[PDB]
């Protein structure tokens, strides 16, 4: 459940009551533009921002209760055009205006329910440096190898588009963390590279609302927030969804955050596969930064690019990946033809690289032999017991400690563990061990980066690097292969 | 295997001999632009194109034996550095130039092995009506509810930045053929939505060199070829690979379907989703069109957004229609499991088994008796039609023309020819089978011999003769989960 906002009688946002924050609808937006919101039918304005007398000109008192006919009577009609009644929310429809007091402004409106969402934030007459941009980035991207070169040349196009200090690129783990996988920075700054955070870090509604709009902006991290006029929709007496908006306030627990950080401004654009948040670019500027829309949607445009090459460049390292587990299982099947301890503990063929794991137990014929950092000799008797109780032909586990609890204090020895049953039951079978997941620094006990690293840590404690699934599916496949060759 | 290029002693192109026809290297470019290349590590120029004398405006002798620093020393270092040995032929490097000869210039660069390919066309700025088009564009084909949807918006949306009489969007169906989905025209037009073509009218390597290069221009169709001097490649003597070049002579094959239709320039836009080309977008228009390097630049990116879109909304339209039918799977349960008569069950109008699997017929056979539902063919080809079905192994049977799966039921195709068969029990004596009727369409236009649109329908008809719509997945798998819900009901 969600808290009700601050002017509704909600209660203070806290380090322990962060994830059930109503950040869609802080009914304030960011000083660096203006908002209004009119009928979707009728067209008259209801809410305005504080700001939006002087941004665009025009007397506050006047702009209410005026139809957006008089007001814009050249997009009027294409705006109801471009948003249809039960459009989504995510749809954008962006126009140039030109007033004399204000210069030429940017009209991104969207429709949220029966509520039409103007912004004015102050733009270019033309802009010249987008139709060579696009053109250069997404060269840059069609020219990479793979995903490490994809994601650094990534990083360092939008560095180099924009200007900010710092520019990364967060993957997201299956168990909801976060990984710094690529960084283009100013020089003379901590890398963040390596580095990974919590999923705590980033609460539920943030992700999704990122999964619906892919870019999303802090201009001033210790600036406040413009209310709304009224702060309530008067069409319902209830909060205004800002969720669409690029304007929307941001949270001030995350602004905090930027502060500790000494970022001045932040921007961040989605990263989305198969309707899932694979990623996110985020960017770092030590000084109040304010992008132009142009400029941005550039940007938007790289967000696109980088979600279809990171497509193509998992598909293509799972397929070789997957064909290298092949070509390494033939060269073990082959072994296994014209053979069982003595054959598998050869190590030129190196069953502790198939899984890439650092322990190997064996047990066959009734005894049990060992290959790397394997716990001592009674810890493996324990193990081997335990794994007889349990069912199936296919173990697998992250952390050992959590679905063995008497195996917690073998954890650093062997953390992770895949194990597969060579003849029916366990009496002969193949076990595989991965080390207690280890790490190092990238580089106060308030929150920050170093609190984030201390907590990842400290939350990933007692599990391994993840068994990758096509490592699980050569598993399965070798044991079919392993049971018929004795 | 490939026929032998023209300048090679290769037989002259016919309509009988298309398909292996080596559209990769004619020798020859079209004659809007020049095209020259050179050694990829010193920059000796080596082929050039005929035309290219002219257009560059220096000596043919001059330009040959000439390294790329020589004529171009702006852009020699940038270029070898965008274009690295091993990178694919696909990646292309596009910079503009400035020739006092021929004005500005548009240069688009490729390297194909140790070979790089520079292209030169005349060039002009683009001015877009709407400075945001391409953007309020991207929403709109993101925020659209299906694929159909999506199709409408992507074609207008093309036809509004470009210009061109005709927009249309073809989705390539399993069996390799064609369908136009969304069609964006000029008024005074005919209109080719629904139109179907067969998979003979794009050969195989016309469909990979589309999946490998995104864009294919054919400035006009009734324009002579510029062989180029010399036509074979001097580093080794074999021809050189031109499917990277922009410039590619179109094949005498479709220029001549191009003129059949009155087209005088065509455009491509390839859909590719995961490495399989889903769809192509084209443009026909009467008279010869050169694209902009910046029109190039927004047409590519839509290319590719596309290609990731259309994936998403397709997928989409596959969940709903799943969800369709499993509603309409429970309401049938539910009447399982309240049996008094299971053929009277069954064939009860409100439960809707026709409509359940969009089929024409039903046979329903169970306890020894048989009944029909909807369009079915007579009694006793049901009698042979169940026998087969019981020679038949499995619990499932799908076709979607039964004539070559089952011979002798070749006759029965206009009142059954897609077929889905579920056995109740094991074995045959209890069974559901759906039927579906020859696929019958009827023409875009509604009012010739020789190649052109008309001929490709009347081809693709003959070709699914006996075939019939084919059985959507969802339909398939809805037919084994009833199959276990069935099994139970006994
Ligand atoms: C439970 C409350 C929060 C804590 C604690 C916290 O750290 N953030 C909390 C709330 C929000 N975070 C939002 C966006 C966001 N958060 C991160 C987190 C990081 N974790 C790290 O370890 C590091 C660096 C070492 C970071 C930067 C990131 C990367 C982002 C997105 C990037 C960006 O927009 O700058 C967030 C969203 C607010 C909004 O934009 O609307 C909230 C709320
Ligand atoms: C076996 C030779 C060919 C026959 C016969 C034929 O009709 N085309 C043949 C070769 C090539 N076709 C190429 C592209 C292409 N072909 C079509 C087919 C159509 N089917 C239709 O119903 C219609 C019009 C109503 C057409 C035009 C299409 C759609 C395309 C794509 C481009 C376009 O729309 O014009 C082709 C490749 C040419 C190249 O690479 O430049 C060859 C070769």
Same mark, same amino acid.
């Given at each position: 459940p969600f808290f009700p906002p601050l002017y509704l009688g909600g209660p203070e946002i806290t380090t322990e009551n962060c994830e059930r924050e109503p950040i869609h609808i802080p009914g304030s937006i960011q000083p660096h533009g203006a908002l209004l919101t009119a009928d979707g039918h009728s067209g008259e304005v209801l809410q305005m921002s504080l700001n939006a007398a002087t941004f665009l000109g025009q007397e506050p008192t006047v702009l209410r209760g005026q139809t957006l006919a008089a007001l814009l009577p050249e997009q009027w009609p294409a705006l109801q055009?471009?948003?249809?009644?039960?459009?989504?929310?995510? /749809?954008?429809?962006?126009?140039?205006?030109?007033?004399?007091?204000?210069?030429?402004?940017?009209?991104?409106?969207?429709?949220?329910?029966?509520? %039409?969402?103007?912004?004015?934030?102050?733009?270019?007459?033309?802009?010249?440096?987008?139709?060579?941009? /696009?053109?250069?980035?997404?060269?840059?991207?069609?020219?990479?190898?793979?995903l490490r070169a994809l994601a650094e040349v990534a990083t360092q196009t939008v560095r180099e588009l924009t200007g900010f200090?710092?520019?990364?690129?967060?993957?997201?783990?299956?168990?909801?963390?976060?990984?710094?996988?690529?960084?283009?920075?100013?020089?003379? /700054?901590?890398?963040?590279?390596?580095?990974r955070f919590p999923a705590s870090d980033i609460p539920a509604?943030?992700?999704?609302?990122?999964?619906?709009?892919?870019?999303?902006?802090?201009?001033?991290?210790?600036?406040?927030?413009?209310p709304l006029?009224?702060?309530?929709?008067?069409?319902?007496?209830?909060?205004?969804?800002?969720?669409?908006?690029?304007?929307?306030?941001?949270?001030?627990?995350?602004?905090?955050?930027?502060?500790?950080?000494?970022?001045?401004?932040?921007?961040?654009?989605?990263?989305?596969?198969?309707?899932?948040?694979?990623? %996110?670019?985020?960017?770092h500027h030590q000084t109040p930064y304010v992008l132009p829309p142009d400029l941005r949607?550039?940007?938007?445009?790289?967000?696109?690019?980088?979600?279809?090459?990171?497509?193509?460049?998992?598909?293509?390292?799972?397929?070789?990946?997957?064909?290298?587990?092949?070509?390494?299982?033939?060269?073990?099947?082959?072994?296994?033809?014209?053979?069982?301890?003595?054959?598998?503990?050869?190590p030129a063929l190196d069953?502790?690289?198939?899984?890439?794991?650092?322990?190997?137990? /064996?047990?066959?014929?009734g005894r049990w032999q060992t290959l790397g950092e394997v716990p001592?000799?009674?810890?493996?008797?324990?193990?081997?017991?335990?794994?007889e109780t349990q069912p199936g032909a296919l173990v697998q586990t992250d952390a050992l400690g959590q679905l063995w609890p008497a195996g917690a204090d073998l954890a650093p020895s062997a953390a992770g563990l895949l194990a597969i049953s060579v003849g029916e039951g366990w009496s002969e079978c193949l076990v595989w061990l991965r080390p207690e997941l280890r790490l190092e620094v990238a580089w106060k006990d308030d929150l920050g980066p170093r609190h984030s690293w201390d907590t990842y840590?400290?939350?990933?404690?007692?599990?391994?690097?993840?068994?990758?699934?096509?490592?699980?599916?050569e598993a399965q496949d070798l044991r079919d292969t392993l049971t018929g060759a004795l």
């Open positions: 055009a471009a948003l249809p009644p039960g459009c989504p929310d995510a /749809l954008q429809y962006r126009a140039t205006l030109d007033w004399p007091a204000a210069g030429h402004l940017s009209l991104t409106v969207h429709r949220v329910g029966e509520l %039409l969402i103007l912004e004015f934030e102050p733009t270019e007459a033309w802009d010249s440096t987008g139709p060579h941009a /696009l053109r250069n980035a997404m060269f840059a991207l069609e020219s990479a190898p793979n200090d710092r520019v990364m690129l967060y993957k997201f783990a299956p168990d909801a963390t976060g990984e710094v996988i690529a960084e283009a920075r100013r020089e003379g /700054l901590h890398a963040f590279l390596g580095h509604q943030a992700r999704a609302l990122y999964t619906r709009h892919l870019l999303r902006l802090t201009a001033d991290t210790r600036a406040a927030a413009v006029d009224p702060v309530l929709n008067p069409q319902t007496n209830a909060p205004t969804p800002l969720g669409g908006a690029v304007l929307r306030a941001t949270s001030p627990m995350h602004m905090q955050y930027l502060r500790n950080m000494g970022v001045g401004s932040s921007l961040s654009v989605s990263v989305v596969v198969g309707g899932q948040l694979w990623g %996110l670019i985020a960017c949607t550039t940007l938007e445009y790289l967000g696109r690019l980088l979600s279809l090459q990171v497509q193509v460049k998992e598909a293509a390292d799972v397929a070789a990946f997957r064909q290298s587990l092949r070509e390494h299982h033939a060269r073990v099947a082959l072994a296994a033809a014209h053979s069982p301890h003595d054959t598998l503990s050869d069953l502790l690289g198939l899984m890439r794991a650092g322990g190997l137990i /064996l047990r066959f014929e001592p000799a009674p810890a493996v008797d324990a193990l081997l017991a335990w794994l840590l400290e939350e990933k404690r007692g599990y391994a690097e993840p068994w990758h699934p096509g490592e699980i599916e």
